[PDB]
Write a protein that binds this ligand. Structure first.
Ligand code: CDL
Ligand code: CDL
Ligand code: CDL
Ligand code: UQ8
Ligand code: PEE
Ligand code: PEE
Lengths: 74, 269, 119, 59, 73, 123, 75, 75, 62
């Protein structure tokens, strides 16, 4: 059950209540099947940005020192 | 050179918020007393961590608090089958050695991780890409052989499988693309021009009435007389719609010695 | 994503790996531990992880977030809700890109074509 | 008297009160959640009787 | 001070413009009916298709192309 | 009679709407609390208003109280305050645990000297 | 379901029956204690102790009843 | 099930009836022990033992009822 | 601190603010001036207690 908040929002559970009968309540679940396939596809069209923006490359030879954390043994 | 304080310290403004989860009178009264003297009380313990001093978690009376583990039906029997149901009790009973063993990770989630390839194998990959964009692919044979030789075989298997996974995910994403970009029969010939100037709020309860009778005051002035008349009109329309009914199909799961189809279950037993 | 209130447990258990977690239905017993009065409709308790969400709201309305929300009945609902959506997000992804891992999938143990049998 | 003098009146009412779902729906209706019912929802009790082994027609 | 310049690349602007188009796009999405059918979001499908058609080419063998710095999850 | 309000339906034609009202009205079951009524129900009286779960004021006020120190600050001040804490690994952080747990031993020193006369009462 | 809850609270009322018989049983116990004391006042202390002791056994049924009541009321 | 369960729990309330009669039988028993003690205190211990002994026969029916109660409550 | 003065308003709508702090139901039955009667009336009650000080010297009680 992925895209929980998206599905709960499409069903209207943030403003109203589902029908108390299983026939219509289940049809409302299958009605968002198209929209989930759409919103998931849109989220996979993001363009790239430099990885070296908020993160130093850990493969850089500068980090081959394998340095330890010096501590105080209180 | 003052010690650093975490964001939580500015919500409470103290390191000694005596938070006890046990909702007994003896406990909450003692906490209020202890919460007031924490500034000059030697028997004071911190619950808000800082750069200079660690802290304790939430207290449960004299012991410590932790939420009930998320229900997990996985268990292991020792003497007899217990039929453990995590939904039959509020708090999970302790595990007795001769009765049951619960699954690992009382407080655990499902994640995906990846091993870090060896450093020398990474340097050979960096040298191949670098020589690729500079000298081209056809002049990177020596850098490719260094990879196949220096990188241990378990790493080459990982590299081999990454390509097959992303190839699988690439198709799974494009199949969703095809289902998503498909034009249904109810949208044939419709474009952005046929779209209405509406937003999300226009489909909410204030603007779009739900499919329930008591969502608003629409049917609050209806009398039994109007109902009997409405029952006659719906029955009138059924004099033309009931003429058709789907035909009964054969039961594909008639044979009990055959793997049944996971067919959609009936709404009611 | 699950497009129903009920799901077969076996469909979310692994076939070629040890099963250490299940995907259980909502714990309706936790709903009776709320001491205060509240209105809950039975049509919303079966859908995955939503019951724990509504309970968290009921508890955050009766109580707040400071010194009164910190009671066992209200924190377990918040922890369940946060944990339910994380597990369901991972299981949903694993079902989308790794359907061969689960029971009931025809790719967990593929049945061969008749051309591969040599008859 | 018509209810007491009947044979199936006790069953149609007992099988309805025993179906936990139909009583869950009624509990929702009492709270203010009600709507229209399809032909398949109207027979929710007939499906319950059939499951028990009763002979009910008109599903 | 050595890598501040990376924030001047136009790809940072391209990333933010894509994020805003998705916000304005999803803000326009709306429920059109309550018949409990897929047609309840009839107009919203066209809106999202325009968004997808705006950053992809549907008339290709693989409209979604793989690149190591792309999206899979 | 049907009443109109801000919440409207989702039908293009008026016949489909009337068909929807006739379908819902045909399913109404009136339950009156007054005797001498054809639709009388002392118990099991259905409510005629639907409940909707919304976040209360106590809900929205406490979530805003959590962000009070962030509204007075700029993004650069927030990072320099709570994120870029100057490294100082000289403190004895585990003193909190030593004091708490070490108090058991110190408490035993004072508790083992209780003037209780009976040996089994100190037991 | 809903009726099961109603009968539970109804049973909880039934617990007031031993509360009634315990009152009558106590009065009878002290009624005999009075006449018993007049017969042999030399052992007033013995009779007195036995009086309260018996009454303690009566309250046992009481706590047992309400205990069962609150249990069935919540279990 | 739920319908029969409602009368099941109701029947469990009936078990509180012996809890009532057991209290009255106790109050009456100790009354006889007191008055009888006054008439012949020479055998106090004898009477005393028989008193509690008789009481044991009262809680007999009590546990029997509660046992039969929870039994039919689930059987 | 200025944003702290508005905390009970961010959680409310305009209609709730009016019904909360503006449209207080009229009730003119309370003894509002009891606040002063208790305070200033304490001087008299305090005098009844203070006039009994066991200080021996008369000029000390002065
Ligand atoms: C061991 C020996 C000692 C024990 C002795 C006592 C045993 C007590 C335990 C009870 C025994 C079993 C009987 C339970 C009956 C159910 C009662 C009930 O739940 O109320 C609902 C019941 C119906 O509710 P409603 O408001 O009419 O519903 C209207 C809706 O529109 C309805 O529409 P809807 O869409 O909302 O649907 C809701 C749904 C809801 O579904 C449910 O909730 C299920 C309800 C459980 C029953 C369902 C199965 C019934 C099967 C039929 C067979 C009945 C056999 C009865 C056998 C009796 C045993 C001798 O369906 C129903 O409505 C169910 C209808 C329930 C009808 C119950 C059968 C009627 C009995 C006819 C005989 C009447 C005799 C009265 C004599 C009174 C003497 C004081 O309410 C009443 O009947 C009101 C009372 C009768 C009116 C007169 C006023 C009398 C006031 C008496 C005050 C004193 C109380 C007792 C004092 C005792 C100490 C002094
Ligand atoms: C001029 C004459 C004097 C006139 C004045 C008289 C009035 C004096 C009192 C006012 C001034 C006091 C000065 C200090 C301020 C304390 C204020 C306060 O509220 O403290 C409450 C204080 C702390 O409240 P709390 O937050 O609830 O923490 C206790 C919890 O148990 C904690 O539970 P937990 O689980 O959260 O933590 C476990 C705990 C471990 O806690 C335990 O294990 C104790 C558990 C209780 C025993 C287990 C059985 C349970 C008993 C329950 C029933 C107890 C009822 C007692 C009711 C007492 C009511 C006050 O371990 C720790 O967390 C850390 C403790 C170690 C930290 C370092 C302590 C430094 C103390 C410095 C001592 C300096 C004085 C010298 C000592 C004597 C030298 C010979 O509670 C106590 O009453 C502690 C009693 C310890 C016995 C003290 C005996 C020595 C007293 C010396 C008095 C002065 C010298 C006398 C010389 C003799 C000639 C005069
Ligand atoms: C079993 C034996 C007993 C063992 C227990 C031992 C422990 C006893 C103490 C604890 C129990 C106390 C019970 C009451 C709870 C009070 C708790 C509290 O926090 O009060 C602090 C209380 C309030 O502190 P505050 O905020 O500073 O207010 C005083 C300001 O002056 C105010 O200045 P302001 O300008 O802000 O306001 C003006 C003020 C008016 O303020 C003034 O004008 C007074 C100013 C004082 C004179 C000016 C010279 C001051 C010079 C400075 C140095 C003075 C040191 C005095 C130290 C005294 C230490 C207590 O007017 C008012 O605001 C409202 C006054 C109307 C209140 C009406 C009276 C209600 C009290 C309840 C009546 C029933 C009690 C029994 C009746 C009395 C017994 C027959 O402090 C005082 O009590 C001041 C002393 C007043 C005399 C009270 C003496 C009563 C003693 C009775 C003992 C028990 C009965 C003995 C029976 C003997 C046989 C056994
Ligand atoms: C019935 O027959 C008659 C008589 O008897 C034969 C007469 O004498 C008379 C003549 C009348 C008199 C001789 C009385 C003369 C009195 C007059 C003129 C007024 C006297 C006024 C005072 C002495 C001032 C009193 C001032 C105060 C009480 C205010 C200061 C005290 C305060 C604020 C304390 C608070 C008091 C209360 C809450 C009242 C409760 C009563 C208490 C006793 C509580 C006491 C509490 C404490 C802590 C001491 C008549 C007309 C008569 O008809
Ligand atoms: C007469 C003195 C006799 C002392 C014993 C003789 C031998 C002395 C040996 C000296 C060795 C010194 C080497 C340095 C050891 C380092 C100790 C240490 O790291 O403590 C750190 C740390 C300081 O905290 P931070 O700010 O986080 O660290 C900053 C670092 N600059 O100190 C502590 O851990 C706090 C506790 C100190 C020791 C325990 C204190 C209590 C002593 C108990 C006896 C006192 C009884 C009376 C107490 C009064 C209570 C009301
Ligand atoms: C002082 C006279 C006492 C004896 C008098 C006997 C005669 C009785 C005749 C009374 C006739 C009735 C006439 C109407 C009386 C009106 C009283 C009045 O106006 O004040 C009422 C008003 C009620 O408050 P509201 O909520 O604002 O009003 C609501 C109205 N429903 O009462 C008050 O003002 C509060 C103060 C009342 C008097 C207090 C007494 C003072 C003595 C203090 C010592 C008592 C011990 C204190 C211990 C403190 C421990 C913490």
């Amino acid at each position: 059950m992925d895209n929980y908040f998206t599905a709960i929002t499409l069903l209207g559970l943030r403003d109203q209540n589902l029908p108390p009968f299983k026939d219509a309540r289940l049809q409302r679940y299958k009605s968002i099947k198209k929209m989930i396939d759409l919103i998931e596809t849109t989220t996979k069209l993001a363009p790239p940005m430099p990885v070296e923006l908020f993160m130093l490359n850990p493969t850089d030879p500068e980090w081959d020192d394998d340095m330890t954390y010096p501590t105080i043994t209180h | 050179k003052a010690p650093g304080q975490i964001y939580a310290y500015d919500i409470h403004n103290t390191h000694y918020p005596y938070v006890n989860i046990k909702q007994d009178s003896q406990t909450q009264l003692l906490a209020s007393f202890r919460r007031s003297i924490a500034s000059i009380n030697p028997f004071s313990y911190r619950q808000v961590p800082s750069q200079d001093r660690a802290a304790f978690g939430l207290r449960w009376g004299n012991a410590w608090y932790a939420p009930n583990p998320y229900p997990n039906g996985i268990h292991f029997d020792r003497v007899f089958p217990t039929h453990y149901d995590p939904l039959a009790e509020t708090n999970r009973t302790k595990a007795n050695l001769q009765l049951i063993k619960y699954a690992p990770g009382n407080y655990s989630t499902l994640v995906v991780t990846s091993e870090k390839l060896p450093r020398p194998c990474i340097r050979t990959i960096q040298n191949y890409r670098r020589c690729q964009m500079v000298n081209g692919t056809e002049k990177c044979n020596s850098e490719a052989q260094d990879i196949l030789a220096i990188c241990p075989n378990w790493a080459l298997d990982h590299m081999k499988e990454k390509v097959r996974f992303y190839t699988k995910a690439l198709a799974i994403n494009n199949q969703t693309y095809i289902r998503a970009m498909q034009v249904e029969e109810y949208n044939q010939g419709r474009t952005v021009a046929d779209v209405a100037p509406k937003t999300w709020i226009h489909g909410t309860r204030q603007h779009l009435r739900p499919d329930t009778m008591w969502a608003d005051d629409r049917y609050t002035n209806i009398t039994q007389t109007e109902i009997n008349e409405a029952i006659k009109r719906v029955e009138a329309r059924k004099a033309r719609e009931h003429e058709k009914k789907p035909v009964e199909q054969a039961n594909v799961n008639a044979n009990t010695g055959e793997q049944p189809v996971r067919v959609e279950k009936s709404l009611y037993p | 994503t699950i497009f129903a209130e009920t799901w077969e447990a076996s469909e979310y258990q692994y076939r070629n790996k040890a099963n250490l977690k299940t995907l259980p239905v909502n714990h309706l017993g936790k709903l009776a531990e709320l001491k205060f009065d509240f209105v809950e409709y039975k049509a919303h308790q079966l859908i995955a992880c939503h019951l724990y969400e509504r309970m968290t709201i009921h508890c955050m309305n009766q109580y707040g977030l400071f010194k009164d929300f910190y009671r066992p009945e209200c924190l377990d609902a918040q922890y369940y809700f946060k944990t339910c959506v994380e597990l369901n997000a991972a299981y949903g992804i694993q079902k989308k890109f790794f359907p061969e891992h689960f029971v009931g999938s025809p790719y967990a143990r593929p049945v061969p074509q008749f051309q591969q049998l040599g008859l | 008297m018509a209810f007491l003098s009947g044979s199936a009146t006790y069953d149609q009412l007992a099988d309805y009160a025993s179906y936990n779902h139909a009583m869950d729906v009624n509990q929702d209706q009492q709270a203010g959640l009600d709507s229209w019912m399809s032909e398949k929802d109207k027979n929710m009790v007939k499906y319950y009787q059939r499951s028990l082994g009763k002979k009910v027609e008109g599903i | 001070k050595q890598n501040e310049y990376l924030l001047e690349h136009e790809d940072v602007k391209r990333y933010v413009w894509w994020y805003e188009d998705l916000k304005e796009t999803l803000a326009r999405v709306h429920r059109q009916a309550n018949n409990h059918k897929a047609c309840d979001f009839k107009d919203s499908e066209i809106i999202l298709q325009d968004f997808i058609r705006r950053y992809t080419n549907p008339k290709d063998n693989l409209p979604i192309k793989f690149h190591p710095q792309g999206q899979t999850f | 009679p049907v009443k109109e309000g801000q919440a409207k339906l989702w039908f293009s034609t008026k016949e489909e709407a009337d068909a929807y009202d006739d379908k819902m009205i045909s399913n109404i079951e009136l339950k009156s609390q007054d005797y001498e009524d054809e639709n009388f129900s002392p118990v099991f009286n259905r409510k005629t208003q639907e409940y909707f779960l919304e976040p209360s004021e106590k809900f929205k006020s406490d979530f805003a109280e959590l962000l009070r120190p962030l509204r007075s600050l700029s993004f650069n001040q927030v990072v320099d305050r709570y994120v870029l804490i100057p490294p100082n690994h000289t403190f004895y952080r585990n003193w909190t645990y030593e004091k708490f747990l070490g108090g058991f031993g110190l408490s035993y020193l004072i508790l083992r000297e209780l003037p209780l006369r009976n040996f089994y009462a100190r037991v | 379901m809903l009726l099961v809850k109603a009968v539970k609270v109804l049973v909880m009322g039934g617990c007031m029956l031993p509360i009634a018989f315990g009152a009558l049983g106590t009065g009878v116990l002290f009624a005999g204690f009075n006449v018993a004391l007049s017969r042999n006042p030399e052992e007033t202390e013995s009779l007195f102790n036995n009086t309260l002791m018996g009454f303690a056994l009566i309250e046992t049924f009481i706590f047992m009843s309400i205990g069962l009541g609150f249990f069935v009321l919540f279990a």
